[PDB]
Amino acid sequence: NGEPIIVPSQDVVLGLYYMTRDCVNAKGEGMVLTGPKEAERLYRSGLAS
Amino acid sequence: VTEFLKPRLVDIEQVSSTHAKVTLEPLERGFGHTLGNALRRILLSSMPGCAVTEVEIDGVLHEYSTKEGVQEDILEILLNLKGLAVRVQGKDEVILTLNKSGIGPVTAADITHDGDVEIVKPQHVICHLTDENASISMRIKVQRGRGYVPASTRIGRLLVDACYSPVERIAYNVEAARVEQRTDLDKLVIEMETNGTIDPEEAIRRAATILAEQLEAFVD
Amino acid sequence: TEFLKPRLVDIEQVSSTHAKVTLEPLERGFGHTLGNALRRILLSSMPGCAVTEVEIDGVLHEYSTKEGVQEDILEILLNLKGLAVRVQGKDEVILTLNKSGIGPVTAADITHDGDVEIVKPQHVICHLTDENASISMRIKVQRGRGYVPASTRPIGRLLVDACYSPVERIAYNVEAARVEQRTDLDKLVIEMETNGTIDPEEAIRRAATILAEQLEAFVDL
Amino acid sequence: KPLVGTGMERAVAVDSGVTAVAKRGGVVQYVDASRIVIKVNEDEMYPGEAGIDIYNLTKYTRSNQNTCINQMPCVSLGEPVERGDVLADGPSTDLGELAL
Amino acid sequence: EIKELLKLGDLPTSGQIRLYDGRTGEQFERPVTVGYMYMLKLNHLVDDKM
């Protein structure tokens, strides 16, 4: 058929799904950022969820 | 004996003036993580520098206010000021003034010249004037500190987050290395991007120096 | 733009195998950095002594028995694998054991040597169940670090895998301090459980020395 | 031994026949890594026999699948034993229970 | 009954505790199930198959 044969599953899918979920009143809510690098810095520092 | 492997091969790639990749080989089992995590933590949370802290605009009175004559909003102006790199030579606090009249871009080059204040990238865009008659004036506080102090914790003036450290991004990876008849060794790769105030290699030097200094009463 | 420097402020001893060390003061974030680095260095790099070779007068291999002895030769080697020795003036030593009579044979029966001391004399080695039985052996002890199986390096020589590491459990904690008149200083407490063959303060000094010598490379460019 | 079990381990270990089970009661006289000697109680003797039970154990013998069969004692000098008691363990047995 | 035994042993009655990553020293975000289990080694050895 015309479908791709390489496809992630299992732990990759669960990790990407958890990574992109959304909560309410988590730590760091309401900030305005300059870009993705600021988000990475804030998350790896420990100042944001 | 008490001798451990010391690396012999050091490789540096300069992607940009503010972008570096460093490779070190060979290490002993487990030492790549040990060095990389400590270096990353120090470079991320314990580096000193100068940054903008507080701003004041005569026309505006609140973060949600709207001023006629400017295409952008107050939030965008604060966001642009948040990423303005600068150096201070021999002081700790300083106030800067910006005035411009006309229609067109408003750029960091327009900042009034000072003696102990140096601009890193002059072609930095702060504002835009749609109308010829409109004009904007402001004052800027620049201080000294460490790490990253958000404005929320600090709690007609506006406060913005302060980025004292010159590090924009830092990351590392560990791979396999095989000295002859010993195929379980470490190879360390480090990726760094700074804000242009200092060179990334120079920052790595400061990080290593600080770490080696803080443990000095225990080394026998 | 200056940092205060930590110092040793306490060494609390609980027993012959349990110790606590206190470092004071630390700046923001340095407690976890130093704690994790030291925990990783301590669990893999400390040197120590271990048994590597065994001789027994009548035995040819470990898949056999001895008349009058309760245990197999293999069980005897397994027992011998867990003997703790402090060696002072060398990296090699050969100990001798001779015993007769009914009863346990422990480490207290090993011949006394001036430069060698045994930290657990009650360590049980084997048993004798007949009054006419006797045992006689020679034990070779060396120094090193890490884990060296006998597989990766005369009929009668018996080899045993050597575990040189004297450290068994490491934990650490970070707490608020009250140094001077500030309110942003911390203290780091390290708890270690060992086999009683290494002094804790020397271990901390050796770990710090290893870390500094490793860091000397990044200072240059 | 397993930390969590069902209670059927002793029955399998004993009915397998890989351990050594005492025939008559008494007391342990000589114990060794190859031999066990039991002195029989008076109530279980016979008019014309000495009263000594001798057990020889299997040491490092290959099985049908090229594995190892070995027996080791689990009784001490001078202890008393009743009939139907485990005297030594075979492979995969721990104090008379099946241990895989 | 399992929870009563756990409470007698001075352990949480959920079976989950907090863990830390041994490479960085950082704490995992959710509590993890930790316990004891019986495991077996089978007669399928890679030394006999390569």
UniProtKB/Swiss-Prot annotation, chain A:
- General function of this protein: DNA-dependent RNA polymerase (RNAP) catalyzes the transcription of DNA into RNA using the four ribonucleoside triphosphates as substrates. Resistance to the antibiotics salinamide A, salinamide B, rifampicin, streptolydigin, CBR703, myxopyronin, and lipiarmycin can result from mutations in this protein.
Task: Describe PTMs of this protein.
Answer: Acetylated on several lysine residues in the presence of glucose.
Species of origin reads Escherichia coli (strain K12)
Give the record's subunit note.
The RNAP catalytic core consists of 2 alpha, 1 beta, 1 beta' and 1 omega subunit. When a sigma factor is associated with the core the holoenzyme is formed, which can initiate transcription. The rRNA transcription and antitermination complex (rrnTAC) consists of RNAP, NusA, NusB, NusE (rpsJ), NusG, SubB, ribosomal protein S4, DNA and precursor rRNA; S4 is more flexible than other subunits.
Q: How is it used?
A: Co-administration of salinamide and rifampicin or salinamide and myxopyronin suppresses the emergence of resistance to both antibiotics.
What name does the UniProt record give this protein? DNA-directed RNA polymerase subunit beta'
Q: Which family does it belong to?
A: Belongs to the RNA polymerase beta' chain family.
From Swiss-Prot, chain C:
**UniProt keyword annotations, A-Z:** Acetylation, ADP-ribosylation, DNA-directed RNA polymerase, Nucleotidyltransferase, Transcription, Transferase
> Molecular function terms in GO for this entry?
DNA binding; DNA-directed RNA polymerase activity; protein dimerization activity
Q: Which residues form a coiled coil?
A: none
Record PTM text: (Microbial infection) ADP-ribosylated on both alpha subunits by the phage T4 protein ModA. ADP-ribosylated on only one of the alpha subunits by the phage T4 protein Alt.
Q: Where is the stretch described as Alpha N-terminal domain (alpha-NTD)?
A: 1-221
Q: Which reaction does it catalyse?
A: RNA(n) + a ribonucleoside 5'-triphosphate = RNA(n+1) + diphosphate
**Domain-related comment:** The N-terminal domain is essential for RNAP assembly and basal transcription, whereas the C-terminal domain is involved in interaction with transcriptional regulators (such as CRP) and with upstream promoter elements.
Family as reported in the entry's similarity comment: Belongs to the RNA polymerase alpha chain family.
| Subunit text | Homodimer. The RNAP catalytic core consists of 2 alpha, 1 beta, 1 beta' and 1 omega subunit. When a sigma factor is associated with the core the holoenzyme is formed, which can initiate transcription. Both the N- and C-terminus interact with different regions of transcriptional regulator CRP. The rRNA transcription and antitermination complex (rrnTAC) consists of RNAP, NusA, NusB, NusE (rpsJ), NusG, SubB, ribosomal protein S4, DNA and precursor rRNA; S4 is more flexible than other subunits.
Q: What does this protein do?
A: DNA-dependent RNA polymerase (RNAP) catalyzes the transcription of DNA into RNA using the four ribonucleoside triphosphates as substrates. This subunit plays an important role in subunit assembly since its dimerization is the first step in the sequential assembly of subunits to form the holoenzyme.
Q: What is this protein called?
A: DNA-directed RNA polymerase subunit alpha
Task: Name its species.
Answer: Escherichia coli (strain K12)
Phylogenetic classification of the source organism:
Bacteria, Pseudomonadati, Pseudomonadota, Gammaproteobacteria, Enterobacterales
- Please state which portion of the whole protein this structure contains, as first and last residue out of the total length: 6 to 234 of 329
UniProtKB/Swiss-Prot annotation, chain E:
UniProt PTM: Acetylated on several lysine residues in the presence of glucose.
User: N6-acetyllysine occurs at which residues?
Assistant: 7
Biotech relevance, as the record puts it, is:
Co-administration of salinamide and rifampicin or salinamide and myxopyronin suppresses the emergence of resistance to both antibiotics.
Q: Which residues form a coiled coil?
A: none
Complex and partners? The RNAP catalytic core consists of 2 alpha, 1 beta, 1 beta' and 1 omega subunit. When a sigma factor is associated with the core the holoenzyme is formed, which can initiate transcription. The rRNA transcription and antitermination complex (rrnTAC) consists of RNAP, NusA, NusB, NusE (rpsJ), NusG, SubB, ribosomal protein S4, DNA and precursor rRNA; S4 is more flexible than other subunits. In pull-down experiments interacts with CedA. (Microbial infection) Interacts (via flap domain) with Escherichia phage lambda antitermination protein Q; this interaction renders bacterial RNAP resistant to transcription pausing and allows it to read through termination signals.
**Family as reported in the entry's similarity comment:** Belongs to the RNA polymerase beta chain family.
Q: What does this protein do?
A: DNA-dependent RNA polymerase (RNAP) catalyzes the transcription of DNA into RNA using the four ribonucleoside triphosphates as substrates.
Name by which UniProt lists this protein: DNA-directed RNA polymerase subunit beta
**Source organism:** Escherichia coli (strain K12)
What part of the entire protein does this chain span?
1194 to 1243 of 1342
